[PDB]
Write a protein that binds this ligand. Structure first.
Ligand code: NFU
Ligand code: SF4
Ligand code: SF4
Ligand code: F3S
Ligand SMILES: [Mg+2]
Lengths: 598, 269
């Protein structure tokens, strides 16, 4: 037992294991200890996969890197390609043309929405929603709930809900429950009424059908989804209006626009209202657990400048907040060797000196699978991981030695702070948060006949509910932003600029024989960076620090815990061998484990 | 009584799972609810930990030799297999256990089929394709990084309708999807045939949709349905959107040199 960051870690209680953690991307093992009252008093995050992309990349052509690192993850597909081409462009001093910037912004924002919405419905919703309870819901009141939760959403009638309910009934009555098999249904940890349950499961099915349309934006600009194509120096989708044979023409752009308009509708009519409603009800039940590090330490590099290459115009402005002081945002520089550093003290890698963290330009990735002496089980059959030694394939990133939470919540807290400091580029997130707080505290409780609450954003946001809320709000904001990007793109093309690639420095003969670059991306899960060193036209070093690397990290040299482990602390479990609460909170970070380890 | 599918995940990026749910014809919703019984799949299953483990035992027992094993990703042989841990144990153990009583085995994508990005040089985890680990079971390879959505559900639909593996080529791929090279029906062929090529990105030739051979297009040596079926309900494909094929359905495509190096001996194509 020891104290760190205000958390009293204690491993004397009952050990509980969750392996595999499901409804995530990739592979994770989670162990916790709980006390006499089923409160989690220790949490251990173990990344259970590694592939070695950083090692694979050595000696390859920097121009090919994006395609390799894109396959780090097919869920946050393209964010790694974006980081990579940005890193090479930065290394070689390449400025991409305006159309290429806008198309990359639109692709980035499409990924945000798709990833966010699919995560909530298809991975997260079953932590909040009892599907079996939905079976015994009244179709009529569900229509009535639907009208209060979202008046503008036209799929509201009782028959429609009855029809959906019946297919579910027949499904479960087959005896083959598929993805619902052995679910934790009927746990007291579920608090929603039948009607809310049926409403959500219905939107689960709607989102499953609609998500495939949204990515057609990726398909147009990048040829396919998953894994659309990118390009060092710009984009491959060359433009010609008339002067049918080119990748991008007006018809293709109209198509893109129609998909963007549909996204905006889904976000405002379905996704944001559901999360507001579900959040209200779990707030009413008192489930404000899971804040972890969000209460103190949050970070993002900052993203989406409305003028290219000018960070002061970032529409999700970043930086770092420490100790819960939202009045002071520290600037974050990814080039500064003393800011972003990764430790491997408790990770299955080795450094020449493991008491220090390495900035990624100096990063090293040599695997070292070794288990501690207090491990229960064997090297190939683990029963209880020994967290006092090396216990994860995830490295331990820190910022000036501090453990940070990253993700949409961090970005929305950072945006709030920035807006209170006078930053006008963050007005929309601020207004989203205040509108949301007012809905969660007053409006939705009034409409459902529940007591009003008076939580401040400070109290409400550092919570698993807040973390879920911030993701939905971010999806909405991204949809709105690419709506604007689309107009700017079409305007630029009509003014006569059809340029999509800068090829001045495409050929390696034009390159400096030695160079370093960094590319940052506000990926769906938080702060992504790729750091590259180029030598004689080949990759000398390529290091990725990925959002889930931050959040999922094991303890550092000082023993400081990461976001996942902190968020599980101080959480009661209704039933210790049903990981409902563990899944609800872990999933609120949207864990991408293939990302975390790459 | 719908055929059980146990969908395992090895070392992977989850892009094959994502591609699968993009399918329009049939909808993934309709395959999951009305065609198959998707009983294990860590991406979407409700249960976790011990409750998830318990599913595998149950369905192998009740449907022995009558479930399909779908594999996304692959097992690593280095690090004693513990560069992919499931339930505190190497993935290769889970793979072998579930494979032995499967009616059929689907290798989803280039990772499962051939090794994928992780098996590119120097392959630090010794990631190994499914068919080189499971040697005594019928395996269908569905390669691509990821495969087209409709190719994935098309394989499933075929196997469900007829209760047979479709006709396979020498490399174990279904002929109904992998019999043509991209180059065979690529809409840019006329340009290739006349020697009309893009030479630099966004040159006049690129704006006219000229052939992408000289920018490294590997369509002439890559078997997939991209040029006809195309992607995301026929919306586009790599070449249509302006990037050459990188050969992503082919064995060892990560190590056939730079994606922007042209194929040699253009006369052969
Ligand atoms: N978002 C995201 Fe990935 Ni599948 C993570 N973490 C990232 O770069
Ligand atoms: S084949 Fe490609 S898309 Fe599928 S898991 Fe492997 S790396 Fe990802
Ligand atoms: S080389 Fe590529 S772009 Fe040219 S015709 Fe063949 S497949 Fe199409
Ligand atoms: S890169 Fe892959 S997606 Fe089709 S066009 Fe080439 S086989
Ligand atoms: Mg790394």
């Amino acid at each position: 037992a020891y104290a760190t960051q205000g958390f009293n870690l204690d491993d004397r209680g009952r050990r509980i294991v969750v392996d595999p953690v499901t409804r995530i991307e990739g592979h994770m093992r989670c162990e916790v200890n709980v006390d006499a009252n089923n409160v989690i008093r220790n949490a251990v995050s173990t990344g259970t996969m590694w592939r070695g992309l950083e090692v694979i990349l050595k000696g390859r052509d920097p121009r090919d890197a994006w395609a390799f690192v894109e396959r780090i993850c097919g869920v946050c597909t393209g964010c790694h390609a974006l980081a990579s081409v940005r890193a090479v462009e930065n290394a070689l001093d390449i400025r991409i043309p305006k159309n290429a910037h806008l198309i990359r912004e639109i692709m980035a924002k499409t990924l945000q929405v798709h990833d966010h919405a699919v995560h909530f419905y298809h991975l997260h919703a079953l932590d909040w929603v009892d599907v079996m309870s939905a079976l015994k819901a009244d179709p009529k009141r569900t229509s009535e709930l639907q009208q209060l939760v979202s008046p503008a959403h036209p799929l509201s009638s009782a028959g429609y809900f009855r029809d959906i309910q019946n297919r579910l009934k027949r499904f479960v009555e087959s005896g083959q429950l598929g993805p619902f098999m052995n679910g934790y249904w009927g746990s007291k940890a579920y608090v929603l009424p039948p009607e809310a349950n049926l409403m959500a499961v219905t939107h689960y099915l709607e989102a499953l059908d609609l998500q495939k349309e949204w990515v057609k934006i990726h398909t147009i600009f990048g040829g396919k989804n998953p894994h659309p194509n990118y390009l060092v120096g710009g984009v491959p989708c060359a433009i010609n209006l008339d002067g049918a044979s080119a990748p991008v023409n007006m018809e293709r752009l109209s198509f893109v626009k129609a998909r963007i308009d549909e996204i905006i509708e889904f976000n405002k009519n379905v996704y944001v209202p559901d999360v507001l409603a579900i959040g209200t009800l779990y707030k009413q039940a008192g489930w404000l657990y899971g804040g972890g590090l969000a209460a103190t330490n949050v970070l993002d590099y900052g993203e989406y400048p409305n003028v290219a290459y000018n960070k002061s115009t970032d529409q999700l402005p970043g930086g770092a907040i420490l100790n819960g002081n939202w009045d002071e945002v520290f600037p974050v520089d990814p080039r500064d060797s003393q800011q972003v550093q990764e430790f491997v003290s408790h990770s299955w890698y080795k450094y020449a000196d493991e008491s220090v963290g390495l900035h990624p330009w100096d990063g090293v990735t040599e695997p070292n699978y070794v288990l501690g002496a207090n491990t229960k089980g064997t090297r190939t059959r683990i029963e209880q991981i020994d967290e006092s030694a090396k216990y994860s394939w995830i490295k331990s990133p820190r910022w000036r030695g501090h453990a940070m939470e990253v993700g949409p919540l961090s970005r929305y807290i950072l945006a709030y702070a920035h807006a209170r400091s006078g930053n006008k580029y963050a007005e929309r997130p601020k207004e989203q948060l205040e509108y949301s707080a007012q809905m969660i505290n007053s409006a939705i409780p009034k409409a459902l006949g529940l007591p009003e609450t008076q939580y401040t954003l400070k109290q409400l946001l550092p919570s698993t509910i807040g973390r879920t809320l911030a993701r939905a709000l971010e999806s909405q904001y991204c949809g709105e932003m690419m709506h604007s990007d689309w107009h700017d793109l079409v305007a630029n093309i009509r003014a006569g600029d059809t340029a999509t690639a800068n090829v001045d420095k495409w050929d390696p003969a034009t390159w400096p024989l030695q160079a370093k670059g960094v590319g940052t991306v506000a990926a769906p899960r938080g702060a992504l960076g790729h750091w590259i060193r180029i030598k004689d036209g080949r990759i000398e070093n390529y290091q990725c620090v990925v959002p889930t690397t931050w959040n999922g990290s094991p303890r550092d040299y000082k023993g400081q815990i990461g976001a996942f482990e902190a968020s599980l602390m101080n959480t009661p479990m209704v039933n210790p061998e049903q990981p409902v609460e563990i899944l609800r909170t872990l999933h609120s970070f949207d864990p991408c484990l293939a990302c975390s380890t790459h | 009584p719908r055929t059980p599918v146990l969908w395992l995940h090895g070392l992977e990026c989850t892009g094959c799972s994502e591609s699968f749910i993009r399918s329009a014809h049939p909808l993934a919703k309709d395959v999951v609810l009305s065609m198959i019984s998707l009983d294990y799949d860590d991406t979407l299953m409700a249960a976790a930990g011990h409750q998830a483990e318990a599913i595998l035992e149950e369905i192998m027992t009740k449907y022995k030799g009558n479930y399909i094993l779908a594999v996304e990703g692959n097992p690593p042989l280095n690090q004693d297999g513990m560069s992919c841990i499931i339930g505190g144990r190497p993935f290769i153990e889970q793979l072998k256990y579930v494979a032995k009583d499967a009616k059929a085995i689907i290798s989803w994508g280039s990772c499962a089929s051939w090794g994928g990005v992780q098996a590119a040089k120097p392959n630090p985890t010794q990631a190994t394709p499914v068919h080189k680990v499971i040697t005594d079971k019928p395996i269908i390879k569905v390669p691509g990084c990821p495969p087209i959505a409709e190719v994935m559900t098309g394989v499933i639909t075929y196997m469900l309708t007829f209760d047979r593996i479709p006709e396979l080529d020498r490399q174990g791929r279904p002929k109904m999807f992998y019999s043509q090279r991209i180059h065979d029906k690529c809409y840019r062929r006329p340009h290739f045939d006349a020697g009309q090529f893009v030479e630099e990105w966004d040159d006049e030739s690129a704006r006219k949709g000229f052939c992408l051979y000289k920018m490294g297009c590997k369509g002439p040596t890559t078997y997939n349905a991209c040029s006809t079926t195309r992607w995301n309900e026929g919306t586009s494909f790599p070449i249509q959107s302006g990037h050459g094929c990188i050969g992503c359905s082919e064995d060892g495509f990560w190590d056939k040199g730079s994606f922007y190096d042209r194929l040699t001996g253009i006369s052969q194509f």
